[PDB]
Design a protein around this ligand. Structure first.
Ligand code: CLA
Ligand code: CLA
Ligand code: CLA
Ligand code: CLA
Ligand code: CLA
Ligand code: CLA
Ligand code: CLA
Ligand SMILES: CCCCCCCCCCCCCCCC(=O)OC[C@H](COP(=O)(O)OC[C@@H](O)CO)OC(=O)CCCCCCCCCCCCCCC
Ligand SMILES: CC1=C(/C=C/C(C)=C/C=C/C(C)=C/C=C/C=C(C)/C=C/C=C(C)/C=C/C2=C(C)CCCC2(C)C)C(C)(C)CCC1
Ligand SMILES: CC1=C(C/C=C(\C)CCC[C@H](C)CCC[C@H](C)CCCC(C)C)C(=O)c2ccccc2C1=O
Ligand SMILES: CC1=C(C/C=C(\C)CCC[C@H](C)CCC[C@H](C)CCCC(C)C)C(=O)c2ccccc2C1=O
Ligand code: SF4
Ligand code: SF4
Ligand code: SF4
Ligand SMILES: [Ca+2]
Lengths: 31, 37, 141, 70, 73, 80, 154, 739, 37
């Protein structure tokens, strides 16, 4: 009934793109 | 110390990464940045 | 002759242009005088906007420069027949290559010299037995 | 699901919503076959009013068959 | 491959590989001393002839030996 | 570089000069034909050996020959 | 304008394109700060940096996929294979620098010089065998590393 | 908006006696024998004869009508041979046991042995095209309906021929009628595709559903009611389906839920006949008709509403893409070759989609049981699709050479794609080499690990296993689809994803195809060969204008042999020779694809069935551990399954042996044209002209060798003919031997 | 894999020598030779 390892890895992959998008926002907020 | 949850192998590498590997390269990049000209 | 006067044409940039041979061994440069702001296809790839007046374009091989000269002389109704193709070295020296006599090679003028002209037919060529170890060629001697 | 004023009511309501949609966002509307007047809606014309009534029917079959099973 | 295809295709391909090596960032350190071109026409004819020959000879020396050594050995 | 030798069978039809896309051939004056001109190749270090001059020539066994000799950066046609 | 891909370094006749993969700000601050490219280093240190990341990962494909993964001498065969590969690698690049930089000996950009590339070869060999031996030593004592990351030696 | 010129070309037979009049250099006189080959090399090059965009377009339109007459007389021949010289009513009496045959052979030289006993006393050659199952799906009962369909097809063949003569010599349309591309697109969407789908939906409702319903009940031939008798008496149709007593009236009030008994969404297969459900396909064609005619009103023609495609192409422009599609509407309505390249690309991919869909969802009754029909239909549609995709790569290059004007499309997508041709091809060949090592070197690696006696180091399933997890997860989603993500569907989309084993007449129709590591390796082989053929054709498209080797390629033409032996050598540099190489690479790609299909389906899918539920396959499950080796592909597939072509003499499958050896002959004959060059053969032919001049018999037509492009063309033609004939003979003889 | 013949120790070192040590120094010497001036 608990979670699986593939759900945790999918959560890491689906949170990888907020890291890229926050990197884009931080870069354009610096300049 | 182990993990009963799913993916117990993952904090075994994420705790030293965010503890050492993330702050060492963050302080390295920041010290290179704030002391350059 | 020694100085290239011109502006670069409007072009976005390509990949088949000047490679690492340009700043090391040699490159070439074509200069011509346009009439309007028309569009020409460079042999590097894609189209470019030919600027008004005297403009300069850097290429990597002489064959691309002569292919552009053919495109300038045939594929326009204001036929551009006053282009000059120079060879640019990385040392800075510029050698006037074409049409260096001043008139096009398709027509004859006085001042040229017959270089590499034989006085015989091809059937009157010598045989490779009599010059078998002279080191020369059967067509040269 | 058969002939009723309920299915006809939601059909006519979404149809006239589609006429308002065509009157709001069609780029060129009038230049077709001319309508006799402008009494119906807008200044559409014959082909334009056939188009927005047909989109009213497409939208009609959409919400009706989307609610006949729900 | 050397028999059917000819040189001009492979020269157009080698132009692109040269461009990719000259525009890859970390491989701009390593540059060729001799300019890489395609094999010449008579040369790659001879190479395809050599592969046809030694390919023929190796597959027949396999079959001619193993069939009569499987039947009589 | 290659060697472009032009024999005396040339009739001065200047097809080979306008066919070669590298400006090695050029018409020099002569007195052995009706056109009173013969092609000549001074800039043989720019010839790649494409033999496009040996496709537009009207004589039997064409009066211009391109003997493929040594190679270089120009004769191999390399942009790198 | 709003176009993100432009000509490389202003002039549009060099065969390259200023592109968000090629010439973005992040690319020219990350590739330009890689050890083979960042300024202010001798080639011995930058060869030592390049060598360590190459030696550290070459242990992997032979300790997991090599022929000695059946037996108990798994990591020893992985180290032996990676030492052979880095020895062939430094033989190739030292012979490259032996034959390419003979002659004119250009002054600037000291990596592309014969003494510079030989310093790069010495650095690559030291970093290569050291990264290979560290990855071997950290894979052979994996029970120790697991014990000091889980904290069961206390 | 119709613009027609009246009588542009006079009808006359005097031009037929002067061959070569269409081109300027051919009508002078056949001074040389190469003129003969040029007469066939420029006979359809309509862009080189006329250069005004109006004469060529009406020439194309009349050529379409002539080719349509060729397809109609071919289809008439199929229905006539199914009427007169077949056993269609005999096969309809007993479909499971006896085998179809629609060609009887005249016994003249001993070829009466080709008329094998196909079942029921009828002799003939057993057909593998499988259009008998098409006829049973449509609803044919007796041979007279096939005969009248052949007669009506020949009538429409002569009608299309008369329309071609009428539209070239009597009333030919103008250029503005051809350039009305939005009217052409929405008429072809609604009135051709959607209206034709509605016609076949009506035929499937009225004819194909009741006839196949009572044929699945078990009604013998000469007892089925005639297909018009269901319309003439609707009670015979209302006793089969309860919804036909409701009439047309629930359709117009959107009471379609009462039509659910005869427009079902069953899916899967029919367990009685081993095909798709006819109610499912009737509902399917009706839905495609509605969606196409809806999409058939998108483009404005005369009434204001509608999308003119020009501002559609104007509106799509991003930061990477510069000016976007600005100029493509002027390209695709002024050049027929760009339209031909797009249409050949999408028709080729459509035909490959047809092959990849007609094996796991068999749409015809008793089609999945006949293994020869299934294998032949798969591989033939695969080959037609791959051929048309190579033609897309050809006509892209012809558009670049002779139909590309660079002054009109500046900084658009075509100019930007031609501006970074190196950054496309130098990554495409990298992924070609990466896929080449990682799909073929895997095969060499476990070939070597099996040859060195160490099977634990291979890439097998018991060895280091490369499990294809993505397609296995997709198969799990398709198995879990009906009830969760397709709740009104009873069965799956197919039984190849996952489900029960469908058995009809002692054979297996479709069982779930599991994907081991052998399917992983062979799919990467498929992606590799697809990438290489899409490298040769794409670098024939992009490098057709100019290059750094030869920057004068546009003035030399599309079809030239070389620029010369200079620059090291420039032979096979044109855009034509990339098609010449891509044809071999299409041959290699599709040969491996149909080999993977034939072996996987006869090792893991086909075979007989047993009443306790166990399935025994044809090759007893060889694909698991023996499809991962090159020696396994040679021994267990090309040696073991070719024995049915080898040992079949003195029997019905005897022509396939002398087509097997025939295809090997044409392959080996192609090598003479591919390997040798012209000047040898010219130096030899002139000696034969000497031996003819010695006896005063030398012809005044000057006899000389083929052109260099002609030599490469006949080499690739005989290569592809010989290889495809060999594979055709092998596949047909094997799958007719196994049943 | 062993050797029943005399001097079984000798192919144990001669096979890696002619396989690796001979062609690596041969290609090294040849690449130094054919690329020098
Ligand atoms: C927040 C993160 C964090 C984490 C995860 C740790 C973890 C650890 N600390 Mg620690 N510490 C921290 C913060 C942290 N600390 C802070 C903030 C302080 C200051 C108050 C301290 C002060 C401290 C002291 C005073 C001591 C520790 C010790 C220890 C270790 C106990 C077991 C041991 O001896 O390890 C053995 C040592 C190691 C595992 C060191 C890491 C070496 C690794 C294995 C080599 C990997 C390098 C590799 C080549 C590069 C890979 C590249 C990469 C990209 C993959 C343990 C690893 C004890 C110790 O002995 O540590 C040395 C000890 O005495 N810590
Ligand atoms: C090209 C296909 C291919 C592949 C994938 C393999 C793979 C393998 N072979 Mg092999 N082999 C091949 C062809 C191939 N072989 C051929 C053609 C032959 C000759 C007939 C052999 C003969 C052979 C023998 C005799 C043996 C093997 C063995 C092996 C296994 C271990 C070898 C090893 O450690 O590699 C070492 C490889 C490397 C050190 C290179 C690693 C490259 C890295 C991964 C690239 C990384 C790129 C990176 C991800 C990109 C991003 C970088 C950065 C930007 C982040 C391995 C599974 C051995 C075994 O035991 O089998 C199980 C063995 O004994 N092979
Ligand atoms: C909605 C009306 C309609 C229909 C049904 C068609 C149908 C067809 N057109 Mg067409 N066309 C139309 C309107 C229509 N067109 C209009 C309005 C224009 C001008 C903008 C064109 C311009 C046009 C061109 C330029 C061409 C066609 C062609 C074709 C044929 C395509 C393939 C084929 O032969 O199918 C197989 C045949 C059938 C399915 C028979 C159905 C038609 C029967 C006789 C009625 C097909 C018969 C092509 C052609 O000539 O093919 C021969 C072709 O080149 N059409
Ligand atoms: C082009 C296709 C086509 C054609 C020519 C017909 C023609 C016909 N249908 Mg029909 N039908 C079609 C498609 C078609 N159908 C489709 C797609 C459906 C599914 C929605 C139906 C569902 C349908 C029903 C339910 C009935 C007909 C009936 C009829 C017949 C009565 C005449 C009439 O006006 O209706 C007529 C022969 C009626 C009938 O049986 O008369 C014989 C009838 O009750 N049709
Ligand atoms: C919609 C389909 C279509 C259409 C309309 C065209 C149309 C055209 N193609 Mg084309 N092509 C296509 C598909 C198509 N192609 C495909 C799919 C391919 C890939 C194979 C090609 C490959 C191709 C090449 C390589 C060339 C063309 C060329 C041409 C143009 C001139 C045609 C010509 O001279 O041939 C006239 C007809 C023939 C020469 C007859 C060919 C006979 C073949 C080779 C043998 C048939 C074998 C047969 C099936 C087996 C039985 C025979 C025997 C054993 C009994 C013309 C515009 C040419 C061109 O534009 O040059 C400027 C050109 O060079 N095409
Ligand atoms: C069986 C013969 C054969 C082979 C092996 C190839 C192989 C190849 N062709 Mg090819 N070709 C052939 C026949 C063949 N062709 C024919 C007959 C034609 C005529 C139409 C063509 C036309 C053709 C074109 C038109 C193109 C190719 C291209 C390619 C390359 C694609 C990259 C690839 O697969 O990864 C590399 C795969 C291999 C080299 C095969 C694997 C073998 C093993 C794994 C390697 C050996 C292991 C190791 C090195 C051994 C060490 C021993 C030591 C002593 C050296 C590849 C080298 C393309 C290319 O080069 O660009 C990408 C390309 O554009 N081919
Ligand atoms: C013709 C000679 C030859 C020989 C003798 C070998 C021998 C070997 N190969 Mg091999 N191979 C060859 C040709 C050869 N190969 C060719 C032509 C190819 C291309 C197709 C391959 C491709 C290949 C692959 C793909 C693989 C092998 C592997 C192996 C090894 C299997 C056991 C192992 O893991 O070793 C362990 C590794 C070694 C013994 C490496 C040597 C390191 C030595 C011990 C260090 C000595 C250096 C020392 C400091 C210097 C001394 C100085 C000197 C003057 C005394 C074995 C040593 C497998 C392997 O894992 O090898 C790494 C493997 O996966 N080979
Ligand atoms: C995948 C990324 C993606 O599809 O981007 C496609 C991207 C499209 O560019 P734009 O977003 O400017 O496109 C607007 C277009 O809709 C107009 O044609 O173009 C590329 O980056 C080309 C490289 C494709 C190859 C990517 C590697
Ligand atoms: C993040 C990221 C990335 C990266 C990744 C990777 C790929 C990484 C790698 C990593 C690695 C690869 C690492 C490594 C490391 C290493 C090291 C750390 C080593 C060290 C060594 C040592 C410690 C040794 C020492 C010694 C000894 C012991 C003895 C001998 C000598 C010597 C001294 C040398 C990329 C690019 C994608 C992008 C962005 C993101
Ligand atoms: C593939 C190919 C190429 C490309 C060939 C290239 C790029 C050569 C690359 C060779 C690689 C480096 C392998 C060479 C190593 C071999 C094992 C040979 C060993 C070296 C000897 C000196 C012993 C051509 O240039 C060519 C030219 C004319 C007709 C056909 C073809 C042709 O088919
Ligand atoms: C043999 C050969 C020739 C010679 C080709 C010849 C002589 C063509 C032969 C044609 C003869 C006349 C056979 C006729 C062709 C068909 C059989 C005609 C069909 C006739 C029947 C229907 C009656 C080349 O010209 C050539 C050119 C470039 C590369 C390779 C080659 C090459 O290999
Ligand atoms: S083409 Fe021949 S005949 Fe004419 S000028 Fe040149 S060499 Fe003389
Ligand atoms: S070979 Fe080419 S470059 Fe040389 S003279 Fe002839 S046409 Fe000119
Ligand atoms: S071999 Fe033939 S195709 Fe190749 S360059 Fe020479 S003449 Fe041209
Ligand atoms: Ca092992």
């Amino acid at each position: 009934m608990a979670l699986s390892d593939t759900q945790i890895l999918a959560a890491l992959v689906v949170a990888l793109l907020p890291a890229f998008l926050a990197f884009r926002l931080s870069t354009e907020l610096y300049k | 110390m182990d993990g009963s949850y799913a993916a117990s192998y993952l904090p075994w590498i994420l705790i030293p990464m965010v503890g050492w590997l993330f702050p060492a390269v963050t302080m390295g990049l920041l010290f290179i940045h704030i002391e350059s000209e | 002759m020694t100085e290239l006067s011109g502006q670069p044409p409007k072009f976005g940039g390509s990949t088949g242009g000047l490679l690492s041979k340009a700043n090391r061994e040699e490159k070439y440069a074509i200069t011509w005088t346009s009439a309007s702001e028309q569009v020409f296809e460079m042999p590097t790839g894609g189209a470019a906007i030919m600027n008004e007046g005297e403009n300069l374009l850097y290429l990597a091989r002489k064959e691309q420069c002569l292919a552009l000269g053919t495109q300038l002389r045939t594929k326009f109704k204001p036929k551009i027949q006053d282009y000059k193709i120079y060879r640019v070295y990385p040392s800075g020296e510029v050698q006037y290559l074409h049409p260096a006599d001043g008139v096009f090679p398709e027509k004859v003028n006085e001042g040229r010299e017959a270089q590499g002209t034989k006085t015989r037919r091809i059937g009157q060529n010598p045989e490779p037995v009599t010059i078998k170890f002279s080191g020369k060629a059967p067509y040269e001697v | 699901l058969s002939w009723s004023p309920k299915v006809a009511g939601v059909m006519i309501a979404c149809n006239i919503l589609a006429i308002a949609f065509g009157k709001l966002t069609i780029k060129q509307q009038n230049v077709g076959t001319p309508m006799p007047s402008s009494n119906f809606f807008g200044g559409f014309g014959l082909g334009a009013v056939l188009g927005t009534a047909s989109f009213g029917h497409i939208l009609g079959a959409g919400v009706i068959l989307g609610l006949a099973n729900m | 491959m050397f028999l059917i295809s000819w040189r001009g295709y492979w020269q157009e391909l080698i132009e692109t590989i040269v461009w990719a090596h000259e525009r890859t960032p970390l491989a701009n350190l390593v540059r060729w001393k001799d300019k890489p071109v395609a094999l010449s026409i008579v040369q790659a004819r001879l190479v395809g002839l050599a592969h046809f020959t030694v390919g023929y000879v190796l597959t027949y020396a396999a079959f001619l030996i193993a069939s009569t050594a499987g039947k009589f050995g | 570089s290659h060697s472009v030798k032009i024999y005396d069978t040339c009739i001065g039809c200047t097809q080979c000069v306008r066919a070669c896309p590298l400006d090695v051939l050029e018409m020099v004056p002569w007195d052995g034909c009706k056109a009173a001109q013969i092609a000549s190749s001074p800039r043989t270090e720019d010839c790649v050996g494409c033999k496009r001059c040996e496709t537009a020539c009207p004589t039997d066994f064409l009066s211009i020959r391109v003997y493929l000799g040594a190679e270089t950066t120009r004769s191999m046609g390399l942009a790198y | 304008s709003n176009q993100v891909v432009q000509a490389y370094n202003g002039d549009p006749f060099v065969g390259h394109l200023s592109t968000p993969i090629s010439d973005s700000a992040f690319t020219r601050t990350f590739i330009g700060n890689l050890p083979a490219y960042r300024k202010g280093l001798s080639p011995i240190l930058r060869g030592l940096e390049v060598g360590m990341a190459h030696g550290y990962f070459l242990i992997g494909p032979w300790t997991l996929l090599g022929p000695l993964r059946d037996s108990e001498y798994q990591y020893i065969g992985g180290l032996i294979g990676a030492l052979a590969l880095i020895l062939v690698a430094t033989a190739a690049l030292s012979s490259y620098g032996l034959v390419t930089f003979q002659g004119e000996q250009g002054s600037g950009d000291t990596l592309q010089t014969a003494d510079g590339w030989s310093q790069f070869a010495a650095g690559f060999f030291v970093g290569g065998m050291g990264g290979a031996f560290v990855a071997y030593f950290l894979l052979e004592n994996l029970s120790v590393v697991d014990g000091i990351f889980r904290g069961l030696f206390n | 908006k119709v613009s027609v010129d009246n009588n542009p070309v006079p009808t006359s037979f005097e031009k037929w006696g002067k061959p070569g009049h269409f081109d300027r250099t051919l009508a002078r006189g056949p001074k040389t024998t190469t003129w003969i080959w040029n007469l066939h090399a420029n006979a359809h090059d309509f862009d080189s004869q006329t250069s005004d965009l109006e004469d060529v377009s009406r020439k194309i339109f009349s050529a379409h009508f002539g080719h349509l007459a060729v397809v109609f007389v071919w289809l008439s021949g199929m229905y006539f041979h199914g009427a007169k010289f077949s056993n269609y009513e005999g096969w309809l009496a007993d479909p499971t046991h006896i085998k179809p045959s629609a060609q009887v052979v005249w016994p003249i030289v001993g070829q009466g042995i080709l008329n094998g006993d196909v079942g029921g006393g009828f002799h003939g050659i057993q057909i593998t095209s499988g259009l008998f199952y098409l006829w049973r799906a449509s609803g044919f009962t007796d041979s007279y309906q096939l005969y009248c369909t052949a007669i009506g097809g020949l009538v429409m063949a002569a009608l299309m021929l008369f329309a071609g003569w009428f539209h070239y010599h009597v009333k030919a349309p103008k250029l503005e009628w051809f350039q009305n591309v939005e009217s052409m697109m929405n008429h072809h969407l609604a009135g051709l595709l959607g209206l034709g789908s509605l016609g076949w939906a009506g035929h499937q409702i009225h004819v194909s559903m009741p006839i196949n319903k009572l044929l699945d009940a078990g009604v013998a031939p000469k007892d089925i009611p005639l297909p018009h008798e269901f319309i003439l008496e609707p009670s015979k149709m209302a006793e089969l389906y309860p919804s036909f007593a409701q009439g047309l009236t629930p359709f117009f009030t959107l009471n379609w839920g009462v039509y659910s008994d005869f427009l079902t969404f069953k899916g899967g297969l029919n367990p009685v006949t081993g095909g798709l459900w006819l109610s499912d396909t009737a509902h399917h064609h009706l839905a495609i008709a509605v969606l196409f005619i809806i999409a058939g009103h998108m483009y404005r023609t005369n009434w204001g509403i509608g999308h003119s495609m020009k501002e559609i192409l104007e509106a799509h422009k991003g930061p990477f893409t510069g000016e976007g599609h600005k100029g493509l509407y002027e390209i695709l309505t002024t050049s027929w070759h760009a339209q031909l390249a797009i249409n050949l690309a999408l028709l080729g991919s459509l035909t490959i989609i047809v092959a990849q869909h007609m094996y796991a969802m068999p749409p015809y009754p008793y089609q999945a049981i006949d293994y020869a029909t299934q294998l032949s239909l798969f591989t033939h549609h695969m080959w037609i699709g791959g051929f048309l995709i190579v033609g897309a790569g050809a006509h892209g290059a012809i558009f670049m050479v002779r139909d590309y004007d660079p002054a009109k499309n500046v900084n658009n997508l075509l100019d930007r794609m031609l501006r970074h041709r190196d950054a496309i091809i130098s990554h495409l060949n990298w992924v070609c080499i990466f896929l080449g090592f990682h799909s073929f070197g895997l095969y060499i690696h476990n070939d070597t690990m099996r040859a060195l006696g160490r099977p634990q180091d291979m890439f097998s399933d018991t060895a280091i296993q490369l499990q294809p997890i993505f397609a296995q997860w997709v198969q799990h989603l398709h198995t879990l689809a009906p009830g969760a993500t397709a709740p009104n569907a009873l069965a799956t989309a197919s039984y190849a994803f996952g489900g029960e084993t469908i058995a009809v007449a002692g054979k297996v129709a479709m069982m779930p195809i599991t994907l081991g590591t052998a399917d992983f390796m062979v799919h990467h082989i498929h992606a590799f060969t697809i990438h290489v053929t899409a490298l040769i054709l794409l670098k024939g498209v992009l490098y057709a204008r100019s290059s750094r080797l030869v920057p004068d390629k546009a003035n030399l033409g599309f079809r030239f042999p070389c620029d010369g032996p200079g620059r090291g050598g420039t032979c096979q540099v044109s855009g034509w020779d990339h098609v010449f190489l891509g044809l071999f690479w299409m041959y290699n790609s599709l040969s491996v694809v149909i080999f993977h299909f034939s072996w996987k389906m006869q090792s893991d899918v086909w075979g007989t069935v047993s009443p306790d539920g166990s399935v025994t396959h044809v090759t007893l499950g060889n694909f698991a551990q023996s499809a991962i080796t090159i020696n396994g592909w040679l021994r267990d597939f090309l040696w073991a399954q070719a024995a049915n072509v080898i040992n079949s003499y003195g029997s019905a499958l005897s022509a396939y042996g002398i087509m097997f050896l025939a295809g090997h002959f044409v392959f080996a004959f192609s090598l003479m044209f591919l390997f040798s060059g012209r000047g040898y053969w010219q130096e030899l032919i002139e000696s034969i002209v000497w031996a003819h001049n010695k006896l005063n018999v030398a012809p005044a037509i000057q006899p000389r060798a083929l052109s260099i492009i002609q030599g490469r063309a006949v080499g690739v033609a005989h290569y592809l003919l010989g290889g495809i004939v060999t594979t055709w003979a092998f596949f047909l003889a094997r799958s007719l031997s196994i049943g």
